[PDB]
Amino acid sequence: DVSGTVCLSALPPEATDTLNLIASDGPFPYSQDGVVFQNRESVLPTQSYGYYHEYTVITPGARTRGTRRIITGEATQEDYYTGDHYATFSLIDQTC
């Protein structure tokens, strides 16, 4: 299940950076940014393989990718944020 919607402005500023890189098709800070996200646990709506892709949202100071991501869906304006390492997601509203 999706945990509601969230305004882009309410997310860390790195989320806005990630969306800007998605808008330019990168290049990204990691070569695996842009792989398919399988939605293997079915938290997001069921779609065929390749509908979803995942991208890092950088955590300040982290040596690793941390726990923050944007998952794109193929539909227009469809993007999900997780701040808890894929446990939960919110739909991102870029209009606010």
CA distance 83 to 86: 7
Q: For residue 76, which amino acid is it? A: T
CA torsion sign, 43 to 46 to 48 to 53? negative
Catalytic residue IDs: 54, 85
Q: For residue 15, which amino acid is it? A: A
CA 30 to chain centre: 14
Q: For residue 18, which amino acid is it? A: T
Integer CA distances (angstroms), 22 to 43, 59, 63, in order: 22, 17, 22
CA distance 42 to 14: 26
**Kind of pairing between the strands at 90-93 and 79-82:** antiparallel
Q: How many domains does the chain have?
A: 1
Integer CA distances (angstroms), 11 to 39, 65, 66, 95, in order: 22, 17, 15, 13
**Kind of pairing between the strands at 90-93 and 5-7:** parallel
Query: Residue 94 contacts by C-beta under 8 Å, 6 or more apart in sequence?
Result: 8, 19, 77, 79
Host domain of residue 80: 1-96
What resolution (Å)? 1.0
Other CB atoms within a 10 A radius of the CB of residue 87 amount to 11
Q: Residue 59 is part of a domain; what is its CATH number? A: 3.10.450.30
CA distance 88 to 53: 16
Q: Name the CA dihedral angle for 65, 8, 50, 88, rounded to a multiple of 10 degrees.
A: 70
Determination technique for this entry:
X-ray
